[PDB]
Amino acid sequence: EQVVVLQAQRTAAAAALENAAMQAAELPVDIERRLRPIERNV
Amino acid sequence: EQVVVLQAQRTAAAAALENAAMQAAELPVDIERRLRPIERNVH
Amino acid sequence: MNAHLANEVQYDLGHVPGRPSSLVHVIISSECLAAAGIPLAALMRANFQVEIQTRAHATGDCTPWCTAFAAYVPADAVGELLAPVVPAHPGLLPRASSAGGLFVSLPVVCDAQGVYDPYAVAALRLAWGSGASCARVILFSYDELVPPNTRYAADSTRIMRVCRHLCRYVALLGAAAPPAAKEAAAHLSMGLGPPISPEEQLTAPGGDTTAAQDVSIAQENEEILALVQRSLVEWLDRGWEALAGGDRPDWLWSRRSISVVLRHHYGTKQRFVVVSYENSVAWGGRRARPPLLSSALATALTEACAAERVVRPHQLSPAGQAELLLRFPALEVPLRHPRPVLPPFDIAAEVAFTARIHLACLRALGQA
Amino acid sequence: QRTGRSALAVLIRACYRLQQQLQRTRRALLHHSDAVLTSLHHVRMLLG
Amino acid sequence: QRTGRSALAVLIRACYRLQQQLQRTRRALLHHSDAVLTSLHHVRMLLG
Amino acid sequence: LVFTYRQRRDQELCCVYVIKSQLPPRGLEPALERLFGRLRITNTIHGTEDMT
Incomplete structure (x- = not known):
């Protein structure tokens, strides 16, 4: 019974x-969408 | 054996x-190791 | 399509069982249909009656049966939603081909302050002929029918392609187009001034809450980044009405938006598609969300037992277990009973019920 | 006396606002992290 | 006029360089994150 | 003598037809539904603008 269950x-x-x-x-x-404002921020 | 294999x-x-x-x-x-002193970094 | 919408009428009139229950639309893939059950050429031989029930968690109380509506397609099931092919002009929209099965709406049992219960069964029955055979049973857990979010924010860019090919075809059709449609293609191009792939919409890594938070956090940044450093839809509707000579709701839903979400089947590992239309009454709908349903209970089982590192929720220590009962009381029923008819919190617990009868049927033979 | 101190006040509005953006996105990233852990512990419950 | 502006130029070299260190280590941490996801999806392929 | 109507905020349609049939006047309605039922669905959906 356990075979079809497992x-x-x-x-x-x-x-x-x-x-x-x-x-x-x-x-x-x-x-990666948490740098594209912060990369251009520098 | 099918119980044994699975x-x-x-x-x-x-x-x-x-x-x-x-x-x-x-x-x-x-x-929590990288970005926690980074608050001090801009400060 | 038409069976996809007539079933929305069934929930509106209240003929469905269960008032706190809500409606879920599902596109079964043809490859999911093959490995689970019936052959595919049988359904080829336009709506089909399917009987659907809902089975409660771990106690053998199921809903008495209700019929529902279904329609099979051999072509791309998702592509028929995205690119409706007018038979008078087959060269309107380009689309990428895909496998396709049938459309079936499903009921999902919920409560007041809507919380569905996981690890319980909604089921299908596809009877393509008389007799015991020709009738396989396809199962669905409530975890199988609940995606976390929609995608129709990230999917709305398909419209501009459809706006483009209408401007393309009227230039190709020329004088054979009626003049108001020949007008409206220029009216679309004033709003303007590749084939549609359903796989590219599905495999795109975009979700509604993930995209809308990233856009709303970026526009807040761009204001601070700036200060420091210093309808055509109505025009579409006339183009459809002129080229088809008429209209159905099948063309109505394709123009507004659509949320087309991949999910994967617990039975035979195959993919299938959960769809929530925009203006619909179902899963995510612009007008009808009383009462909206939450996935908080499936969240409450995992993260409570993740820090406890316990594999099964009935193996939890009773001090940490009793907080779940005092918060959410729906789980009190399969946990408190010492001997239910189904082994609780198991996915194959449905299949064990078939095989336990199969032993009791055999065990009564050899003794008698 | 007003333009140079306002030029510093832009730099007051520059850094002290952008530091507060850092704190919220990490907490939003904790929703990105815990969605994995909600998923992963759920997988073993399908085995057990 | 030169020493105080060079003292600010050190602070120009202080913060504007250290901000660029932040961006690269997150991308290096994305190599630390995706190595988990490369590992985890590989485990189910050993089951299937 | 059979007309056709298409109600929309768009410039609208008209036709006139002369239909020869064995059907009675009491039973013409499913037959005209079989021809012009495509136009029938449109004026149920549209033709309600602007009705708030």
């Missing part, structure tokens, strides 16, 4: 990081 | 996860 759990966890990859890809771009 | 991959999941999850916790430590 097989589902890996495929369950194989959804959220791919949603989180689109979430974590903003971390370069949003943090 | 429970091994469960252990293969969280092992490499927590190595970079601690390394994800390394991220806000530097930003």
Whole structure:
């Protein structure tokens, strides 16, 4: 009984990081948007 | 054996996860290490 | 399209089950449809009846069934939203091709002071023929149907391409265009003076709260950086009405804006699209947000147990556990009961209920 | 006496305002940091 | 007239150089941040 | 004798038709809906400007 349950759990966890990859890809771009006023500020 | 393989991959999941999850916790430590004396820097 | 909008009429008239519940639109991808269930050529053989229910968290109380509306496309499902192809003039808009499935609106159970519950099931049933077969069941967690934000601020730049190709086509069509449309192309070009890719809108790293905060923080900087160092939409509507000879709401929603968000399926790893129209009643809507719903409970489970470093929320120490009950009481039901019918806070807890019956069916055979 | 002190008052409005911009964006970056930690601890709850 | 303006020119060389140090170390910290994200998405590829 | 109307703040339409049919006057309405129902949807959506 646990086999189909445990097989589902890996495929369950194989959804959220791919949603989180689109979430974590903003971390370069949003943090790069904190210099473009401050680079021209100098 | 299908329980044996997938429970091994469960252990293969969280092992490499927590190595970079601690390394994800390394991220806000530097930003409180870098940018906190930087307030004094302009001052 | 038409099934995407007639289901919005169902929530407005109140025929849907659950008054605090809210409506969520979902584009199922064709590749998500294949690995989960039924073959694709069966739905090819224009609305289709789909029965939808909602299942509560960890206790076997489901909603009695209600039918809903659906429509399958073989072409680009996202590209049909973005680039409506008038059949009288197929050369109007260029678009990038994509796979496409069906459009289904989904109900999501909420409360007063709207907070959906995670780790519970909304489900589908696609019956393309009579009998027990031809009827697969596609599941959705409430975590699967909730993106954090919209994207229709970052997606509004597609309109200027559509404004450009109308000015392109009237110059190409010339005298065969009616003169008021031949006028209005110049009226668009006074506002003005590549093909539309749905993948480029989806893979763009832009979210509504992320983009609007970065713009609103930059314009505050630029004022300080300066002091120290010192409608065409109505013109569009006549162009559509002249070239199509008429109008449907399918052309209404494509012109205003659209929020087109990638999400990924817990069952068969495939992608699918959650859409909230601008003027709609659903997920993010310009007119109808009583009562708006929050993702605070899924936030409250993780960050409370992250500092505690506990894998499961029922494994938490009862001193730290009891603060969650005193704040949010909806989680008190699956946590307090010693023996529910479903193992709580598990995603495969639905699938275990099918297999526990499968053992009890077999165990009664060999004894009898 | 007024133009040079106003030229310094622009420099008063220059640096002392821009320092307060630093403090808020780090807190906004703490929303960017904790969104990762909300995501990461949620992944193990899908395994457990 | 020369020593006091050079004392301000040291303060010109003080703050305007140290601001440019801020911009590069954040980009170096983006190499520290993206090394986590390169690692984390690689972990799920070992599961899938 | 059948007209056509298209109500909009735009310059508007008109047609005249003479239709030969076996249908009664009591049953013409779904037939004219099958032809001119494209124009029927437009004057439901538009034609309300400016009505606040």
